Amino acid sequence: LIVNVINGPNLGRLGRREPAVYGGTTHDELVALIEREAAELGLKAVVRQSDSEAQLLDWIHQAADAAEPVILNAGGLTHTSVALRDACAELSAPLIEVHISNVHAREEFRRHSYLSPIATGVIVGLGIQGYLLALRYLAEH
Amino acid sequence: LIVNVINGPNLGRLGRREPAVYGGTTHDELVALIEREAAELGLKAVVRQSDSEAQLLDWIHQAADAAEPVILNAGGLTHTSVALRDACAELSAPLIEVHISNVHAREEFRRHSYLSPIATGVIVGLGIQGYLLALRYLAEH
Amino acid sequence: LIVNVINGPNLGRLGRREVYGGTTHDELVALIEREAAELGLKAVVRQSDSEAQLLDWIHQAADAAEPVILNAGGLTHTSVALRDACAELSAPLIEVHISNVHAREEFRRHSYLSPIATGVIVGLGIQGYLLALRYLAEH
Amino acid sequence: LIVNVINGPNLGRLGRREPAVYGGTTHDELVALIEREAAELGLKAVVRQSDSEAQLLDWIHQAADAAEPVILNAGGLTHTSVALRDACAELSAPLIEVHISNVHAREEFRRHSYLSPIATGVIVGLGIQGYLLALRYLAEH
Amino acid sequence: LIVNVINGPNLGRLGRREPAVYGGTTHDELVALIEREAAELGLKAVVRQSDSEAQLLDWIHQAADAAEPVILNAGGLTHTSVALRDACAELSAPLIEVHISNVHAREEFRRHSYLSPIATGVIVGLGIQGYLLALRYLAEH
Amino acid sequence: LIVNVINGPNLGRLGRREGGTTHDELVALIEREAAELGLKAVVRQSDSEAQLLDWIHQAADAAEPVILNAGGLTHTSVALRDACAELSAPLIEVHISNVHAREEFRRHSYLSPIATGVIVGLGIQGYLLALRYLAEH
Amino acid sequence: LIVNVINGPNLGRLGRREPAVYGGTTHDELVALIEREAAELGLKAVVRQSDSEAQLLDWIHQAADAAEPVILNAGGLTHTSVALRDACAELSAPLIEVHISNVHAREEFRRHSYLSPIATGVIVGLGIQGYLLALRYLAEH
Amino acid sequence: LIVNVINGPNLGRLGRREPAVYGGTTHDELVALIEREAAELGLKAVVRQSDSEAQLLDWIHQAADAAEPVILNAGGLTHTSVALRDACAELSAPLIEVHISNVHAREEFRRHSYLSPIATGVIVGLGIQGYLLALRYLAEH
Amino acid sequence: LIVNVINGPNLGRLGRREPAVYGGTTHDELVALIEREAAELGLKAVVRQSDSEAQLLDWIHQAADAAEPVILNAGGLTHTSVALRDACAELSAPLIEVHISNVHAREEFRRHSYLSPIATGVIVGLGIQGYLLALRYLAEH
Amino acid sequence: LIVNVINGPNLGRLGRREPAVYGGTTHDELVALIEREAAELGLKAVVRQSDSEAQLLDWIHQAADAAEPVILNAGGLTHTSVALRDACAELSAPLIEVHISNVHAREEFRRHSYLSPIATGVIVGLGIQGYLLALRYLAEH
Amino acid sequence: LIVNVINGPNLGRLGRREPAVYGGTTHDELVALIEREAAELGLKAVVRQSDSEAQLLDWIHQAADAAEPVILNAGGLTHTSVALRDACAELSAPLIEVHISNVHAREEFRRHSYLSPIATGVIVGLGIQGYLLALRYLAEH
Amino acid sequence: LIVNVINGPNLGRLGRREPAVYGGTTHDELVALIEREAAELGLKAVVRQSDSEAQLLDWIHQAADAAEPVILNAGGLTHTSVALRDACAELSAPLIEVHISNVHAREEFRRHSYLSPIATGVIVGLGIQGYLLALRYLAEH
């Protein structure tokens, strides 16, 4: 059972700066953490990160075609991209929107998400653990 | 450690009505589910519900005095109540805001929350499992 | 059958003074019960300044599949809790306002109930409640 | 005592389309039903319908000049006509604004009315019976 | 010469938290300072606090029936409660809206009050002394 | 301590037209209450924004507190706000009328977010209530 | 030459019911005044009034083809008619918008005009004499 | 098949007193061009224009009863008429909204249409050829 | 009877720039025109210009104490000054707001006036002749 | 004459979902249809699709350099990209914006386009036929 | 070649109250810096400050008549003054708007400028060096 | 001492067409001017341009990891890109935002920038010299 975990722009640099806002973990540490939690639940997690909106669209496309669930932290494109929203709306399996930081306690523009209205559900502010709680929801649904 | 799970107006009726929106589980079964998960996790779950703002405020106050964390589904008061937000901001232990339904796929006025800017984090649209995921985050701190 | 008339905060002091007419709350319960007997209905007329109490009355009506005529006072404009309790009614809900809320302060022009109500009557004074009965008498 | 019942554009076709929104009663049938209820109340009803704003303005002018009350379902002109509002503000007898459908459960632009601030009262969402109820109000003054 | 001083939700806990916004004086201390100033001024002050909306309305109804002035710090109901405003609008004697904190220098939502337009006057930002100044006004009036 | 009471535009004509207290009368009341509180009140009025700014600059330099009724400039003047922001002693914004029961435009104030506190609609006594707060620090 | 004076809906009832929001002068009396004042200025005024938008459009069309000035009191259509603003935008000669009452001292919706951005100029609040002054502007070109 | 092409206010004046914002083609030349295209397409076009909203409504009621498609350029009433929108919402055959000018390159208010949300589709800015393209859509369905 | 004509900031420089729609007339030539016309009417005009807000307020205070009328072109302050509005709001005689240019055909910020709602009337876009029309109005009251 | 038909993100997947919203025609079959209609018209169509914004900008830069027309369905970038609008605004030949779906009958965010104000004109809701009607306008200019 | 540097209200107090904003340089010191840099560049700088709007207007009127450029830091009047804006629009030589602090990083009202749309360009946030950069642009014309 | 100058989409085509907006200088020429003034100043300028947001993000990451300053003309992404803003907010060295044209003099959407609030300073409207002025600020830190 495959679960795609997809990270958007700038998330490749997790841990290098403001560990107050996004955690101390780097992206390789995140990938290993998610893979371990996913094996413990009976799932396989494919974890991918890209700064390129076209590349993220490609991965969502493949997820739609294989009818696989998506855990998406779209970074900045969360608030700006209709193209990514429409590609995510093709997913027949669940879609969990994840934000490491509490986007409601930050700038006003971070409060609006193209993704939330079409997601199965949203987890915000729970730090890197939010990804792990999303997998666990997909294990039980 | 004690975790408080507080439910706001109307959630006493959980399970009888709009089962595609809220669960099929009743509040009684909900309380049981939470307690069992909390037990597994090394925690103790104190799960209470009320339709009165004054009573919710009283329980939040108690949690603040006790330095205990709160998992709050405020129901309609989420969107309307400054008095509740202000009492919640007194918590020193974590506050997770939970909604059973995906408040972002619903009427616009449900997209606005007084609680979210002052919560540690927010979990929405993951049905009743959002409560159990919130327990799991607090297990980790 | 039974029709529930539910009045919200401040409405206990009807006709008292210190817009809404000179009829008191006692006199209105009597009016509604007279008119409803005449229509062949049983009217239960209840008032509470407590939101939680209003909800419990709504919940009861919804369990018994009975109609509600609701003047929710200030909470018309402010309570999502109450809207959601009323959205559970399977029998009709008629939202009533004694005053013409459209001829007053701008904030009184927004109701959380109207979108989920069967219909709404506004500005016709106390008779508003009687017209709602007459509507419910025809179903 | 004459009461003037006035219907705006498109309502000549009542009963024929959107019966789920505007009822299955035709406009001839409405006129009869209203005339009957008026007589039972001790009133005489003059029911008229035009798709023409100039026409509806004329009939309002006559009602103002005879000091007769008006029951008005102005149809789409509810939302758009300042001219109709002003003609109506001249009236010294009462003005009751009626809508068949519940205009607050429908498109956002139907929630705004130039007539409501200047009317004695408003009835909405009670079907055709909404006209009978306004007649009952007027018999009582 | 009776003055009612009425405190709304959360204010039973004054001085216990956020002492930089609301002060270090407790509610019981505040009762005593208000009582002492009211005596100096030739007034009898009745100081009451509640978390319950319905209870505040009853207190205001009694002030209405006895033509007594009210000094009101409605706390969070300031910005949300029309029922509270309506009850206050029946007062024939002066009404003083008081806030301890400078509500204009805090969150945007605290900058709107249902009470101010119908109050005699408003004092904000002058701490606990705001209530004492409102007493002095009423002794003058 | 010296406390500066500053009145903005049009306030020189108080008492003419609707309280009945004139500006001379107002100065006199303020000075009395100030002395009863152990303070020396300096009360000035100007229709000129530049002059108002100068008075505020001087209170900042002398670390004195200001009671300010800015009149119509309350709702309009960023330059006045910034001058007041420089004050290290408390600033109290006072309005004679209840600005919240009037036109919408009067419900916005450039001064309130930077003031220590605001007193509105208590008439001329607001100036004396603001004196009393200042006397207590 | 010829100057067109066009009044829109409700304005044929000037004088009766009414003001003075709009004066005590009647529409016949207004016609006489304008004609007289126009005579004195060496102009011929043609004064016409209609509650029909299509009829007012027709009169503007005639003025556009005759290359004649227009003094326009559009009534409620001032605030609502794009079609009237488009007819008037065709005029090559001057267009003077006139309102009897001071539209800026009334309801907010009257403060908005489709005609003002395309008019040569606007006169508001000077009563009926408003028309006579526009004539005198037209006499000077 | 019969197709109705209905032009609303001021469009009788195509080509006379203004543009190209609108082309140099007169209404009669547009009628001839539309009839030639229709015939080439195997259809019969009926082209009607009015400055009167009531007349437009009558024509729309007829097309609805005749189950005939409509190409509508409602002119200024596009932006203003709820009554025209509702008459159009009843058409069972396609409705194509056409504007000669590019309404999106003009005033802000031209950018809102009551008709677009209930139209099959919309063509704007393509000049008079827009009508001939709408016809061609209808010949293919 | 004395009439005050008061021009605000930058107006001293009339006819230096840019001749539509401020005109080619200088401030000196405008004083002379206003004076002749005032005499023709049986009135005395006192025409004054200043770039100082305080100076304007003083001139307004004089007219208020002398129960004299004012024709005011506040220039930029029309849009920005509550002080100037409050000063004019004291005038017991008529106040006419004048603008040389059609402020409705210009920047959106020029369509808001603090003066218009308290003025007797308003004249816009009729050039320097606006001031003479204003005098004419005052001659008749 | 080369015409460029450019499709944006997700549109390579046409025909796979929401047929319904976008039709059953695949991208391959669309290219063939547009090629064949172009030939009928004496044009040569070059039909390209990409998920990459950078790639779209290069294709529009080439059309700007070669002075060739563009039919552009920008998909989600329609409502979000200034960069795309600016590159389009450089086009010297006609630019026709196409949407397969009726974007005004869908979410509010879809009713805003960066492209429309600088397009020659806009065709929406006519299905894939919209691309062929756009070719036909270009054949005439 | 003369260059007017004009400083608006409160800027006389530079240096002695907000090093973080604003900076440590006094007005006298800024004068000497600017004159020095200007000499380096072959310009003569005239640097002037006033808290009086009438005074600033007069200096802008003078630079207008002498066709000299202006570096303007209007302080608070930037956000509030139409009069200042209009005087500035008369300059034929370049007008450089300067702000010492980054006004986009501050309260939302400092983000609106009446001067930006009419300036040649604008420099913000580069501290006092902003004045010296503007001179360098003017030295290049 | 390295300074990176980074240009966004369409800016490769500088100088070619639109020279009254963006100058007649081409990109190659810009790079030569920038490198020459950086030498003059004791600095090394690395000047790059890309139409790809992913590439831009990578350039900004490398500047963050090297603690180098950035002068950024983001082009259209200025107004639209949160992902860009976030990458820029990692920069420990100064960030200068530069726009060639005066964005406040253009369309309203150009007056909003995601970069301004997190930049050190912003230069707009000063043409190509804007970049050289930003180089000079940075020389002086």
Ligand SMILES: O=C(O)[C@]1(O)C=C[C@@H](O)[C@H](O)C1
């Ligand atoms: O996971 C984060 O909280 C986020 O999604 C990442 C980068 C920012 O652009 C988002 O707004 C928040």
Ligand SMILES: O=C(O)[C@]1(O)C=C[C@@H](O)[C@H](O)C1
């Ligand atoms: O958990 C639910 O999704 C909710 O919190 C409950 C009741 C409603 O009032 C809230 O909007 C959503």
Ligand SMILES: O=C(O)[C@]1(O)C=C[C@@H](O)[C@H](O)C1
């Ligand atoms: O009965 C009505 O007029 C009302 O519901 C009663 C009290 C007020 O709070 C409502 O706005 C109106």
Ligand SMILES: O=C(O)[C@]1(O)C=C[C@@H](O)[C@H](O)C1
């Ligand atoms: O009868 C009413 O429901 C209505 O007035 C009739 C026609 C529509 O235009 C209104 O919005 C509702």
Ligand SMILES: O=C(O)[C@]1(O)C=C[C@@H](O)[C@H](O)C1
């Ligand atoms: O007195 C106080 O400042 C307040 O009234 C009390 C609690 C908060 O909820 C109000 O916003 C401010």
Ligand SMILES: O=C(O)[C@]1(O)C=C[C@@H](O)[C@H](O)C1
């Ligand atoms: O003191 C008064 O209430 C006020 O400050 C004076 C003049 C007006 O401009 C203010 O809005 C209120």
Ligand SMILES: O=C(O)[C@]1(O)C=C[C@@H](O)[C@H](O)C1
């Ligand atoms: O004459 C004017 O006052 C007006 O044009 C006439 C009738 C109303 O509908 C307008 O708002 C004002």
Ligand SMILES: O=C(O)[C@]1(O)C=C[C@@H](O)[C@H](O)C1
């Ligand atoms: O044909 C069009 O350009 C239009 O429909 C005609 C007249 C105007 O009122 C519309 O805004 C555009």
Ligand SMILES: O=C(O)[C@]1(O)C=C[C@@H](O)[C@H](O)C1
């Ligand atoms: O005469 C008028 O056009 C105006 O009063 C004069 C100067 C400008 O500042 C106003 O906006 C209009």
Ligand SMILES: O=C(O)[C@]1(O)C=C[C@@H](O)[C@H](O)C1
């Ligand atoms: O062709 C369509 O209708 C559209 O251009 C394509 C995809 C969506 O992102 C647009 O909103 C509509």
Ligand SMILES: O=C(O)[C@]1(O)C=C[C@@H](O)[C@H](O)C1
């Ligand atoms: O130069 C400064 O940044 C400013 O111009 C000075 C004073 C404040 O009023 C401005 O907002 C910014």
Ligand SMILES: O=C(O)[C@]1(O)C=C[C@@H](O)[C@H](O)C1
């Ligand atoms: O440098 C220019 O002024 C700009 O940064 C470049 C391209 C456009 O998209 C921006 O709005 C302005």
